[PDB]
Amino acid sequence: EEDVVKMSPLPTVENQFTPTTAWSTSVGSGIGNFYSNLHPALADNVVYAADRAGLVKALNADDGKEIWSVSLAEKDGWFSKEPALLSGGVTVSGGHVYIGSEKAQVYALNTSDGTVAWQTKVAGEALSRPVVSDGLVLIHTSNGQLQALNEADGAVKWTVNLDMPSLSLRGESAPTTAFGAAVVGGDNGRVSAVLMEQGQMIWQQRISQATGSTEIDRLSDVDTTPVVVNGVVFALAYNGNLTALDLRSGQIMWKRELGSVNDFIVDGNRIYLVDQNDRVMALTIDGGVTLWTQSDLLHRLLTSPVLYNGNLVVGDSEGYLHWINVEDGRFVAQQKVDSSGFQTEPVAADGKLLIQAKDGTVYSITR
Amino acid sequence: RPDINQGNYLTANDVSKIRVGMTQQQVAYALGTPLMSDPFGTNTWFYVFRQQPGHEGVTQQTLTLTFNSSGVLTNIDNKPALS
Amino acid sequence: FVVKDIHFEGLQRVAVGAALLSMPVRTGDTVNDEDISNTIRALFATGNFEDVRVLRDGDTLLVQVKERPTIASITFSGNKSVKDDMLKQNLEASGVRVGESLDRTTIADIEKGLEDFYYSVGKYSASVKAVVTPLPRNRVDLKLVFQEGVSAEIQQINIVGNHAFTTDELISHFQLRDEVPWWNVVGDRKYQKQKLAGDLETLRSYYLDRGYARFNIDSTQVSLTPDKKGIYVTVNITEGDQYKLSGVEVSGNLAGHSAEIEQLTKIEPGELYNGTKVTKMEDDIKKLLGRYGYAYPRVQSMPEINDADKTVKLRVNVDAGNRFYVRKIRFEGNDTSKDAVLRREMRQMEGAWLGSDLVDQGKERLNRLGFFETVDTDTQRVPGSPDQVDVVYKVKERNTGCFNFGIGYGTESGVSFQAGVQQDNWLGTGYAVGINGTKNDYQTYAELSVTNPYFTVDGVSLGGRLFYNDFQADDADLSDYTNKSYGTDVTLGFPINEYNSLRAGLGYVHNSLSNMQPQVAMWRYLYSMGEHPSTSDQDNSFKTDDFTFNYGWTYNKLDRGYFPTDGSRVNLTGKVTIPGSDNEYYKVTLDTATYVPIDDDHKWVVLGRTRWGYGDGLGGKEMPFYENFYAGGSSTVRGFQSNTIGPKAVYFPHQASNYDPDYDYECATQDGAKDLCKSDDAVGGNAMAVASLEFITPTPFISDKYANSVRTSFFWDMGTVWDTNWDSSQYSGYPDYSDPSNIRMSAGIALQWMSPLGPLVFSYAQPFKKYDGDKAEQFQFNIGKTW
Amino acid sequence: PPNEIYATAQQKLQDGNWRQAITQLEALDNRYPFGPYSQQVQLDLIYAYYKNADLPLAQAAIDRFIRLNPTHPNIDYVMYMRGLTNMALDDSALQGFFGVDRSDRDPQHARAAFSDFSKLVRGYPNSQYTTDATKRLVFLKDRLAKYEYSVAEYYTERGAWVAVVNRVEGMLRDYPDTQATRDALPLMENAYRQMQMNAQAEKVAKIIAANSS
Amino acid sequence: ANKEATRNAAALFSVDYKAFLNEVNNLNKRMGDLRDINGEAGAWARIMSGTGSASGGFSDNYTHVQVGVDKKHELDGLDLFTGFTVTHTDSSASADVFSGKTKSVGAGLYASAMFDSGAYIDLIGKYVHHDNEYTATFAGLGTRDYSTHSWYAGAEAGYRYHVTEDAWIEPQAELVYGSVSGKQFAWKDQGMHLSMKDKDYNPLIGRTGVDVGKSFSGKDWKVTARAGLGYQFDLLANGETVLRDASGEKRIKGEKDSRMLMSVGLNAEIRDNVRFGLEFEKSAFGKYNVDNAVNANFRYCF
Amino acid sequence: VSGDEAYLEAAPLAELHAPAGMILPVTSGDYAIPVTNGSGAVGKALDIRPP
């Protein structure tokens, strides 16, 4: 949200078809209208969701059931019970569910009443997705640090230090795995790729130009996951600097001026992304050609635009599910199954689409 | 009435260590800068030490250091009592 | 071609020096068309002229420059929740003020600064547009348009790294919280950066005080959302181990004060190491050395931390300098007060050893005068003198000749006015000149008091006041008699100790009594001396001129100006009539108030107030009836009418025809009753005794106006008034007023709040032992002091 | 239109009210960069602030003027006006409190005025204001003396004889030529006599017996 | 029954309405001085003396003391002052049939809000108790004391327009709502029962005022002089009187009046801690016109 | 001027004599008033009009 332009009119295309067998279950107290990384992940066609106050639940495929509520408040003050701020989101792998927290704690819980969970102290609060790679759960904590954890309890943990910009925008920089190497955006435009075994060969590349350029109150943050395509990663700073980088520790930086806060989605040979002003545009797999731009949802809370059935499914701040064509970016279907908006990345997998809501009303899409 | 204090603080060991014929520089180093002076003619320093506690007697010790231009031959006149 | 002269065309608001420095060429230089282009580019790049056009009209360079337009005004538009004052001072501090040069890039600079302070004050989602309007004579108008959004509250301050203390108390040390708003009533919670740095320092000090000597803060991140509805700040810290201070070692040059500072050094073992305690003992070492004349002691304490035993050792290295002497004491800012007035109130003498305690005492006494806004002391050295020092008391002078007021009330008891001028420093001469005026429903009193607090340099005060007094004939528990008094008294008062002060003075009074009601309490005095008034006829007059020797003593052992908690205040006031006047008598009054604490924090404390009065004639004369004592109301026994406890008036029969406007008065219906009329009217007596035993309890309300400005009190009050000259032997069937019995006894609750006008007293008492039909005063109320 | 505002300012300043006779001058000052045609405006502004009793603002403006053009054919008038502004701060009245004034009150304004008038007198002795300053200067040297004489009185009443002798030494070293110093020689004699300094007392005796008052 | 009894009953239930008009009359000058000259807070005291005359030989002389404290809290684009006051007034009202002595004690809460554009809005909540001594002699009634509890909510909104510098024109609107506890007197005269009563009435009183304010500045003094003309009126009923007597039931309608007032006065600040506020209020073209009304603003010492 | 007349009111200043066998304190004060030989502008008339 930046209010550069006023909230733009939204044309409505009526869709006579509603998602089938679709349930809206409330997880915890809901996340409210505050943006964070808490978003459900599905594994084995089972939904895993989490909420602030350390409240984690699971849901079944249809009419969400197997709801085992686990509240995690241990090691969070032995004199009083306080809501351990979870902000690391949910990542599922090997039957283990990894969650960050703002008390510097990484939780790893199990399937089938994973009340027995192992938790690790991490230097600084954990705000990024704990992404998995080659049997290590690695997390970008907003002390400018990268940490790795083992699947069992964490035994091989190595730290990588990053730049301290002292002015940040909620570093959500969840790393991406390519060729056994983790590549991440920095908290101020230092895209770096490191290997395992102590994360050596630390090489940094400057992408953002708004860091230390008199544009700094809480700006110039790379809060987006640097998606890898064909050994090429795409890095988006908060203000401009959409740069393409080659995963050979090179110095070749070619870029187009676009700044964003949410993840861009590369599907086939196409890129769909949401700018920092909340409008969607499409670009080529390689280059900076703006194929189309939809200007009908300006400055309304938008998440990462996810591709479902070859159709861009997006969620606004007023609870409208928009199916948009992927060739010129026009609305082709509109649904209203929730009266509250959305501020967390939806997920499309296992023939299902998962959307988490402000009020925790998780909605399932099976078209 | 309040207690009244006037002049340099003199202790018995500060005057016993002032002996005949030294220089005024280390005299000012030891006893401090005198709060009196003789502006008329010869340079003379008067270390006056007066308590007037207010409910009892006035106590004065007057130590006159008379010096020549060279500051030698310390003419020391110590009166430990107000006559 | 060749430059011969520089012609300034269109230059209005630009100095010649800036243009001469900015141009890249000089007179006589070879200038071509390329040089003209270079000159135009340099002049445009200097940020002084918006437009530059240089032409060569032969050998003359005509330079037509449109300057940077002078800001005609700065206007803020759409300000619904922002004031223009902080906006204007922020703009001026940004190097941009009304009249200065304004550039195209300075639009971005002003927008960025203003938006940065909007994000500082939490007024986020605001779009700041700086629109430009031209105006002739090189003028510009910069209008700011604000697309203001919602305010951002503190959503969470994350203290990561807590394993011994909860975040909640640490945040309570912060001023930035998420609870119900207390500093706003229409808006919401709010952020500021200077308090963030201050409260980060408070967090560090808090952990150093609790015992964590290895405490360290690793990082501080500022967390702002792109949404801009909530504020987060992360303070990543590292707690240490709770360290126990084992013992303090002091070394250095102590100048013979070792046994005095060693007993101040070291703490009982087992105590936690506190950084504040270490700084406090360093400050106390500095003050101890300052008391003896050492004003600049080189003092620092450094610890070793032995983490093996969790112990801390302190070396307080102290070097005592030279015994500094006050060469000269200077006063600054006393533009309208005698320097003698400022120099009387000082305990440090010029040309003496420096007493830092004496200098602080001088500052405290100058504050106690009340003539000054602020008193500041800078003990600044004399240049070139290693032992001399000059003490300066910078005072901000405020004129103190300010109108004061005070008001009381009581149910069925009327109001009381206490208006007055109180010029407490006349012309800066340190003379207190006051005109005070008290008004009741039965009494007026005007007074002109001129006081010299220093008639002698020791502190002897000479105070003379001229008083006029008048009692009406209104039904207010006082007899109907038109008496007017006027007098002058002069009192010399001196302190025989810092808590004991004696007073002695002479006072002349005149009383004119006209048409007194016939009654046998004062008619006994009228029969004692002078003429013999006629019963059943008030057409009478009585004029007295009295010369009295007044004396007194005041013992003040109390503390605190807010609310007394310990010590006894005794005020003895006596007066004996000098021979050579129309009356002969003596009065003695004793007013004692004792505060004793039964609590270490002095929350529960005991107040014993007691007021004795005895007045008796000398020789064959008698006590004058207008100098009688009275009890009841505020400052005495409460729950009874103001001045209502005591002997009740015994009216004689008298005619209905009266000088008073109304004939509905009692005992004067047509000719009076056949026998003496018992009235409920109060005339006082020769003697009085009041005693209040009271308990002070802490207030349950704190943190809104605090418990130091409000006091709650539960009291019992006894009061008797009797005249020793009452003869009940000849008066049977009437209450006996000769006995000291009939002690009217009551009790109640009182609340005292310090209003900025002055003390405010509200009391709810109840009289549950009253005699002869007294009057109840369930509510008692007062503001300020009566003086 | 600077010419007509300046002309109206002159005509309603010479024989007109002064409350709004500075308003057009300050409007010209705010409008102009303080560059061309502003020297007469600044001098008119200082004169107007003085006789309108705007002493601190006049002092600030004159402090600003002295650094801008320290060389000027009327800089002597500027420094003379600065001394006048300090001496007018020295004499608070008009709802002020007086009777003997800074002979017993804060002398910093008088001391600053003395320094400024001394800068007049020894900077431009040929100036046509200097005689006035030279004869104002004398009054201030008397003024600054009486102040210390009061201190020499009060400590004499207190019995702080070291303070009295040091104050009278301040007199004889700084104000030796004034009357208030002559009035203070008996105090130095007294302070030397309440000490066993009878040599210093009779040494002051011949000074006070040098037919001085 | 008797004409004197009916005129006494009308006069005694017009006394409370006249006192209500007098007590609503004096709120506005406590707010005007805050706009004209005010610091970071205020500890103020007001003495006001009023004399009024009205038909039936009704002359009222009254003295009014009040003290108050207000604190300023700066907010972004808003200057708000919140304060509380304690007030007492004493009045003697004489009419050809009776004499009334009114002692009123009350507590008020005032909140005022200032905008940078000169527009302002303020409100008062006032809780008061009146103890009233009525001496009435028409057929024999004597002296009686009674207590009345009254609540007021008064809202005012004004706008300052600076057509010129140093002078301004200010329209203002006052609306006061009172809730008054009724009082009933029942007695037996000559063995025959007389009752008199009023119903709990809530009079809405409205003023529309226009004030011209000029200013004079000095080195240490500032005098702001205002002339304010206001239309005062009552929108709702002011209450009625019900008399039960041997002749039956009698209804007396309350006196409803509208007037215009020239509120002319000045507030002077001759020194940093010496300021005053003087007001001279005179009514015209109305049944009840105040002969004079004088105000003083003082205390405020630092 | 703005205050009272202050450029005619004054008091003459006169030197102190030094009796033999002793000297006055060295007058090192910076309050010296140098002699002027200019024409007076003192009295009632004083042109303080800005030139």
Give the topology.
The complex is a heterohexamer of chains A (367), B (83), C (787), D (213), E (302) and F (51).
Chain D: H1 2-14, H2 23-31, H3 39-51, H4 55-68, H5 75-89, H6 108-123, H7 130-158, H8 161-174, H9 179-193, H10 198-208
Helix pairs in contact in D: 2-3, 3-4, 3-5, 4-5, 5-6, 6-7, 7-8, 7-9, 8-9, 9-10
Chain E: H1 3-25, H2 28-36, E1 41-54, E2 58-75, E3 78-95, E4 98-114, E5 119-136, E6 142-159, E7 161-164, E8 167-180, E9 184-189, E10 192-197, E11 204-217, E12 222-234, E13 240-245, E14 248-253, E15 259-271, E16 274-284, E17 288-299
Antiparallel strand pairs in E: 1-2, 1-17, 2-3, 3-4, 4-5, 5-6, 6-8, 7-8, 8-11, 9-10, 10-13, 11-12, 12-15, 13-14, 15-16, 16-17
Chain F: no helix or strand
Protein name (chain E): Autotransporter protein EspP translocator
Membrane topology (chain E): Multi-pass membrane protein
Subcellular location (chain E): Cell outer membrane
Largest beta sheet of chain B, briefly? Answer: 4 strands, antiparallel
What is the CA–CA distance across the termini of chain B? Answer: 23 Å
Compressed to H and E, one letter per element, the order of chain B equals EHHEEE
Question: Can you count the helices of chain B?
Answer: 2
Q: Which strand order spans the largest sheet of chain E, edge to edge or round the barrel?
A: 1-2-3-4-5-6-8-11-12-15-16-17
How many strands of chain B?
A: 4
Strand order of the biggest β-sheet of chain B: 1-2-3-4
Largest interface: D-F, 58 and 40 residues
Portion of residues within helices of chain E: 10-25%
Which class best fits the helix and strand makeup of chain B?
Answer: alpha+beta
Number of domains as seen in the coordinates of chain B: 1
Biggest sheet overview of chain E: 12 strands, antiparallel, barrel
Spell the H/E element sequence of chain E.
HHEEEEEEEEEEEEEEEEE
Query: How does the overall form of chain B come out from the CA principal axes?
Result: elongated
What is the number of independent domains of chain E?
1
Q: Report the oligomer.
A: heterohexamer
Domain Autotransporter (chain E): 36-302
Protein name (chain E): Autotransporter protein EspP translocator
Subcellular location (chain E): Cell outer membrane
Membrane topology (chain E): Multi-pass membrane protein
What does this structure look like?
The complex is a heterohexamer of chains A (367), B (83), C (787), D (213), E (302) and F (51). Chain B is an alpha+beta fold and 83 residues long. Chain B has two helices and four strands. The longest helix of chain B has 8 residues. Chain B is elongated, with a radius of gyration of 14 Å. Chain D is an all-alpha fold. Chain D has one domain. Chain D starts with a helix and ends in a 5-residue tail after the last helix. In chain E, the strands form two sheets. In chain E, strands 1-2-3-4-5-6-8-11-12-15-16-17 form a twelve-stranded antiparallel barrel. In chain E, strands 9-10-13-14 form a four-stranded antiparallel β-sheet, with helices on one face. The radius of gyration of chain E is 21 Å and the shape is elongated. Chains in contact: A-C, B-C, B-D, B-F, C-D, C-E, D-E, D-F. The interface between A and C is medium-sized, with 34 and 32 residues. Chain A: Keywords: Cell outer membrane, Lipoprotein, Membrane, Palmitate, Signal. Chain A: This is Outer membrane protein assembly factor BamB.
